Each structure stands twice: as structure tokens, then as C-alpha cells.
Predict the structure of Terpinolene synthase.
Amino acid sequence: WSFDFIQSLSTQYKGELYTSRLNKLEKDVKRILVGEENCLAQLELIDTIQRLGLSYRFENEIISILKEKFNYDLYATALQFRLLRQYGFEVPQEIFNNFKDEFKANISNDIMGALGLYEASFYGKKGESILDEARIFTTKCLKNYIEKNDDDNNIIALFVNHALETPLHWRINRLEARWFIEMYQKKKDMNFTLLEFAKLDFNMLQSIHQEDLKHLSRWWEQSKLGEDRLVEAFLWQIGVKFEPQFSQFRRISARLYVLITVIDDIYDVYGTLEELELFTKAIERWDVKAINELPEYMRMPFFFLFNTVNEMGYDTLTDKNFINIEYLKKSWVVWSKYQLEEAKWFYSGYKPTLEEYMKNTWISVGGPIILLHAYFAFTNPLEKASIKFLEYPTIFHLGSILLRLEDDLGTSSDEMPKSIQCYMSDTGVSEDEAREHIKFLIMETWKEMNKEMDFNNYFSKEVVHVCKNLGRTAKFIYLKGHISDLIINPIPM
Amino acid sequence: WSFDFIQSLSTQYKGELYTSRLNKLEKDVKRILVGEENCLAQLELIDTIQRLGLSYRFENEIISILKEKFNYDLYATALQFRLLRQYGFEVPQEIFNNFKDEFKANISNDIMGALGLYEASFYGKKGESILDEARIFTTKCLKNYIEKNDDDNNIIALFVNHALETPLHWRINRLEARWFIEMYQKKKDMNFTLLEFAKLDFNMLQSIHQEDLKHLSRWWEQSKLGEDRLVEAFLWQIGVKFEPQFSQFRRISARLYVLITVIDDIYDVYGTLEELELFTKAIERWDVKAINELPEYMRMPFFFLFNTVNEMGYDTLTDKNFINIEYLKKSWVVWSKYQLEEAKWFYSGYKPTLEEYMKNTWISVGGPIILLHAYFAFTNPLEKASIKFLEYPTIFHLGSILLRLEDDLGTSSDEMPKSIQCYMSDTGVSEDEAREHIKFLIMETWKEMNKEMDFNNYFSKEVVHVCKNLGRTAKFIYLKGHISDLIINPIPM
């Protein structure tokens, strides 16, 4: 994973011949989708296409088809429910009373219906007890089917394992796309043109991602802050905003993921309280003349953060005629203040309750910084709503809290007090039980975020995507093969 | 000359096969040079090699050979004198009394000796009256030979015209290299291996220059300050520091040449005194929070200048562990102050004497900024001489004054009070006579700068090169074909 390794990343799936073929396949698959008269087969086609990762190329077509579905068995009712819930349509949670007497026992015999219900249950908003009942009962059903039944050629078991590992609603698009492209060839029903379009689009998107990663790699190399978690930060852009036209975002946002990651280490690892006070006060002053005051090893990271954030502010001034450097500076100020508070906790030995830890850490996790950059990237700030707003977003709180809880559930073994240990302090439980409670808190935050709709909110749909994908990518990252799957090697066409 | 035009610049003379061939030819030509026993033929070989532009690959070999020349006719005495003066050797100006009775009249009959003497005369330091006599008499001789004798096949006349246009000591290396590579094939004495090495090295250097220009082009494109004299600024790097290993310098210094060029236009063209006061005071404050104060059209250029200069300061901090942002800020402060003084002169209608204009304009021409960046690029600032020095360099004064006088002599027709017109104000002369006086001032500044030695000075030899090449490139730029000669099309191998 050296610098020359990343710069040597290349692939054939780029150019005008491939782009013409991609548009050909795009229109072919578009007419295949719009042409299917069978309502249920059309819903299954929608699900197949979106699991191939191509949902970003048929948004309006899929929404128009689903404005036609506004008899079915459990798998079909669950698929329709999930696809309607996904695109902002209102279908009641109580459409599953048709499958109860609690839930019907024969659903255990209906393995595919149980899997569809499991997938649909994770779209449950807060207060939808029927969908949580479905979640629990279907998790039981699927674990039972897995225990009941080494075969490389058994699709039902592989799908059940994949869903138990992480449901559709929580998995990032690129990982699910690669896995389902691999799986779709094992179907006896598969469409060859659909698979060809999936492969080609995934490969061209992988080429765009390779170029973005090489860009970020050159940027971090000329930082000379390695003479080093670069690709870990770009995996975040693969999980957050994978679509092509968001190249620049991926190239710039990743820097935040780098910078945060670096400066956290200055706080949680290398910094005495005097030097951390100096660093935080230099960020608060935010002046290129405050660099003499910092110790020698702190000048370079602070100077680089200064230049990078000012470059982002200039990007906003040049793309949207707006001066947001004040707000980026303020976000880094608040982040640095809460990081310094955590450093004081570490030195003084403070072990807070879970309440204090949760009130604190969702800000110092880096969430608000990334989300403010995304806001200024996908929101017109010359509008009235923006100018009024800048004087806190619930969706940002939920996204940053999902980020924090996933980070802690991933890094508690390697790096350990965090959330699990604070809960072990408050209530007296073993680490297993506290990890389970943190998982429950994650699921509660998810079902609360399912209320914030995607496509028509106070914020742009891209910002809602960035928040929910912050959550999903946090779940994915902390959870070498598949990094190479997504970034390095194309799908063999 | 669009952005996609520059990004589409490509050439084959890049890679490892060509690099291996280049090293083969380099060692072959090196042993050809060291092997020639004939002292006079060896001096002629040195001159041929250096006029091919390859002097940057045989510096130590040439200096060691010239430590062997420490009988001859006029051409040989002049060539030896010029080559000894070029590399810092001390040869008296009075070695040409052997060719006097004033100078010998038969020198008019000795056309090649007259040309060699003309070329050697421009190495005359201040106070060497013999060399100025040689300059005048040889200019007369060569103009007479040109008037006395449409043939495409006459080498003596073409060489005399080329020298009259600009002597060797004043012409940039790349232009002379291209022209002499074209001319060397017309010789009956030519060495084929030498010509092949010249062609190959020039083409690989042109490839490196193409890449540097594409880098600068992308940088200026993402500035969005064009949605535009970019290649004009990179011609400056082609003239200032052409050697390969100075890629980064060429990529960064050019930005100055851009930024200055832009901000001068904000002063000399678009700015009222209120807005210019605001701009200069915002530069003096040098804070990202001073951007609200500037009018809308000034925020973007000031913000971009801020980010770029801070990036240069970070480059210094990362490559040489030194905080020089104070000095870059101070250089831009002084430049902005003198530009605002000139704007006050324009509005109030002030027409200064040549004395005031010369005391002022060599600073506002941009010279000191470029030269300070070059200083921090090619000088170790952790040394005692640097730390003591930063508390004004004569070589910078001379380079910036050559820059100013060449700029004015070039742009007086298109853009017109400057130096010529101020001299017309003080002394009552027509514009022709004042242009001639400005040319004389340029030659006086050159013969004063010939005292500042190249290879062992208070400053690094690269800084001395940057200053003298500032002068030469100023003479060249203001003086579409040859831009394409140097940048776009290789020499047909």
C-alpha cells in the first residue's frame, strides 16, 4: 500500500468506447425495467437492479414505477413495503397483521419470506412495534435456518448469512453491489444484459474511485506528514458518496477524514496538556502567525490543517460565492475544545457516566466537521434557509452518534473509557452485555433516523445521503481482501 | 491555448528506454569532450556543447577543462576569454591590446573574430573600458557585414544576425539551444553523436516542461479566476530555471508570476483608491477574516493569494524546517504598498522624475517577491548567514531593475508614465532617444551585475542563476511560433 503502489493503480474501464457501451447498456436496462408489465416481477427487477448498485442510474424511473404500487405473499408484501419505505412512500407498519395470528409460525417454513421480512424490518421508524417484532422473529428464523442447514453451491444459505452479517438498509452500496454481482451469476433466472451493465458500471465507477484515491494520495504525499492511514480515509468516501459526479467531494471530504484522524492522535496519543492548550488556542485564533507559539512537532500539522481548511473555504467562495471559512473555523474550534476536554479527562483520570460521554463524544468524533463540509458542498448558501440556519440539526446528531458508537464498538478491543466501558461503570455488566447495549443504542439511533426522510428534507437529499452513509460506513469500516475488491481489481468481465 | 489544449500536451520523449539512451549519449559526449587533446578544438567543443544547451550536464567537466587554460588568434582569444569569464575565472580585460594599434582595422576583415569579440564584450564588468570599446567596434563591424552581404544557406550571416538580435550572454538557454540545434546540422564539421544527444536531452527537458505547464494549468483552472496569462507565466520558468531537477520551483514560482500579474491588474486597471486601500490593508493584516471587508470582486483574488502564499510557506516549513511565512507576507506587503503608491500617482496625476520612478518601481515590478521565494527555495535557512541576513541584496536590486527596464521597454507601446516617458519629462528628448537611454541603462545594469559572480557568492549559485535569468527572461518575453518551438513540438528526430 505504498505511494507508488497507489499511483500505479490503473484499469481499462475508462474512455469513450466504454462510455458509449455504458450508455447503450443503460438505455437497454432502462427499457427492460420500464417494459416489464408484471407488477411483482417488476418489483423483483427493481430490487435486483438496486442490489447490483445501479439504483443511482434509475432513481426517477424507480420512483415513477413505485408511484404505480400505491394478493401478495410474505416475500412480495415485504419487498413492496421495503421498496416503498426506501423511496419516501408512506405504507403503514400494520400491513403485516395479515401474517400474524404474534407472527404466524409457518413463516419459519417460509425462509425467503422470513428473509424479506428481516430486510424490511430495518426500515422501521421509532414507535413501529410491529416492525421490531418482525425484526426479532425474523432474526430468530434466519439464525435457526442457518444452524439447521459447506456447499459452495447453495444460494439461500449465502443470502441468509449475508443478511445476518448486515441487512440491506445498513450495508454500503459498493460492497453490496460487488457481492450481489458475484451472486447474481449463480441464479438460474439471471439476465445477461443486466449483469453486463452491472459489471461495466461498477468497473467505470471503480476507475473513477481509483483516480480520486490517487489524487488524495498525491495530496497526502506532498503533505510530507509521512516522511499514514490514507486508504482507510478514502474507503470512507467509497462508503459515503460513491456516485461518479461526486468526485470532488470524495477528493476533499477525505482530507477531513485524514486531518481529524491525524489531529486526534495529537490529542489522544502525543500531547501534554500545555501543548494541547497551545494547539487548541492556535486553532481558535486561526492565524498563520500563531505557528511560532506551537512546539516544533505541532507546527506542521496545524499549518497543514490551516491551509487545507482555507482551501475548502476558497472552494466554497469560488463555487457558490459564499464566505464560510468562519463556520469551518468554528467547527474545528468546537472539535478541538471537546478533544482537549477528553485529554483533560485522560490526564486527570476522569471516568464519566454514559450520559456525559454521549453528550460529549458525538462532537469530538469528527461528525459535525464532515457534515458541515457536506452541507456547504450540497446546499446553496445564498438562499434564505441557509442564511437563517447558520445562527443544531437532529440529523447531524444522529449521524455523528452512529459514527461514534460504531467507532467505539470496533476499536474497543484494539484501543482500550469509551461507551461500552462507561456503561460497564454505570450499570454493573460484563463487556459482552455492554457491547450488546451499545448495539441496541445503534439500532435505536437508526430507527430514529428512519424518521428523517431522504429525498425531501430541510437539507438536500445529498446531505441526508451523507449522514445515513456516515452511519453505514462507520458500521462497515470498523467491521485486505475486500479493499482490493472495491478499489484495486475490477470484476472479471 | 485553451485548458484542454494544454492538458492534451504530450510527447514520446519520456520513459526508461529514452532515459537509458540519454545516459548512454551523456557518457559518450562526456568522453568525447574530455578526450579531445587539442586545446583550441576543445574550447570550440565546449562552446558548441554549451550552445546546444547541454552546459548543465557538464558543469564540472567544463570547469576542470578550463582549469587547464589558466598563439591564439582573435576568435580563439575571444572564445577563451568568454569561457573563462563565464565560469568565474579571472582573465584581465587588457588581453585584447594584442589586437589594437584603437582596435586594429583588419578586424573588420576578420568577421568571425569580430563576432567572437562581440560575444565576449558583454561579459565586461563595470570599469572595463577595453571591453566596451570592443562591444562598440564589433557592433559596428557586424552591422557593416550584415549591410554589405536572401540565401537560406549562409551560416556566417545567420550567426551575425542572431548575435545582433541578442548576444549569447543575454539570451535564455532554451531559445539558444533550439536555434543552435537547428543551425548545427548546417555545419560541415558537425558531430552526429553530439547532435543526437542535444536533440534527445532537449526533448526530454521539453517533456518535463510540458508536465510542469500542465500542473500549473490545472492549478490556475481550479482557481476559477478565468471563468488569463498562464503560459506567459510559464515561459518565465522556461527562461529562469530550465534544468530538470527544478521542476517544483518552476511549478511554484510561476504562480507568483501569475499572482503578481493578476494583482497588478487590480491596481493598475480595476481599482479605486478606497478598494485599493482595503486590499493593501487586508494583505498587511493577512488574515482570513479580513475577506468580509473587501468588495466582492476582490475577495476571490485576495483569498487565492492568501492560500497560495501560505502553501509556499508550508512548503518551506516541510522541506527545510523553517517558518518563512512572515517574510513572504512582508514581501507582499511592501509590493502592495508600492503598487498603491503608483495608483495614487495615477489618480492624483503625479508624473515623477526618473529618479523617483527608479527608486520605486524595481520593487513593485514583482522582482523582490520572486527572488525571496527563490532564496527560500535554494538557501538553507537554518544556517547562520540566513538567520543573520533576514534583518538589501544588491543582486536582487539589479535583477529587479533589469526586469523593470525590460518590461517597460517592451510594454511602452502597448500600455502607454513609465521609465522612457519619465526620461522624456526630465530631459527633453523624443521617445526614440529615451528608449535608447533605457537600453543604455539596461546595459549598465548588466555590466554592474557581471561583478556579482555566479558560482561562489553569498547566495547559492541557483539564486544567482535566478537573478541573471530574471534579467534574460525579461529581455526575451517582452521581445506564437517559438512558444510552440519550446513547449509544444519537439525537435524532429
